């Protein structure tokens, strides 16, 4: 499923180490497009962290940070303040291509895909999450 979006990426960053992309089997995966330089992400990111902490286990999802930072130091510092996963900075080309694939034109943006099938579940989670902190309508399926 995820090979479509992350072709040939076997590992993702978690904290100061890595996990295998295989560990996402059966999960909903949210690609979180953001950057340290993005003003509206400052207010949004803590709301996503609260939702993640409450529900990532019980609602069976993961978040993968897809950076629009162009400096490694900016990327690393920003990711260090997140509890979830990241596409490694070295694989930024994959992130740019993914941004194009989903027509991400502004950040922050949050897109949820099913890991096993690769199917798109929601493209609007950055907008819907802030209005549904208890996830009563999760995963905010697209029509």
From TrEMBL:
GO terms for molecular function: thioredoxin-disulfide reductase (NADPH) activity. GO terms for cellular component: nucleus. Gene3D superfamilies: Glutaredoxin. It comes from the Eukaryota. InterPro entries: Thioredoxin-like_fold, Thioredoxin-like_sf, Thioredoxin_domain, TryX_NRX_thioredoxin_dom. It holds the Pfam family Thioredoxin_8. Disulfide bonds join 38-41. Residues 1-143 form the Thioredoxin domain. GO terms for biological process: negative regulation of protein ubiquitination; negative regulation of Wnt signaling pathway. This is Tryparedoxin. The lineage of its organism: Eukaryota, Discoba, Euglenozoa, Kinetoplastea, Metakinetoplastina.
């Amino acid at each position: 499923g995820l090979d479509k979006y992350l072709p040939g990426i076997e590992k993702l960053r978690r904290g100061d180490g890595e996990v295998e992309v295989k560990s996402l089997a059966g999960k909903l995966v949210f690609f979180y497009f953001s950057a340290s330089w993005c003003p509206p992400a400052r207010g949004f990111t803590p709301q996503l962290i609260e939702f993640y902490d409450k529900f990532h286990e019980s609602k069976n999802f993961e978040v993968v940070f897809c950076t629009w930072d162009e400096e490694e130091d900016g990327f690393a510092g920003y990711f260090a303040k997140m509890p979830w996963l990241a596409v490694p900075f070295a694989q930024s080309e994959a992130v740019q291509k993914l941004s194009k694939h989903f027509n991400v034109e502004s950040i922050p943006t949050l897109i949820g895909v099913d890991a096993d099938s690769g199917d798109v579940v929601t493209t609007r989670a950055r907008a819907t999450l802030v209005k549904d902190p208890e996830g009563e309508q999760f995963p905010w399926k697209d029509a």
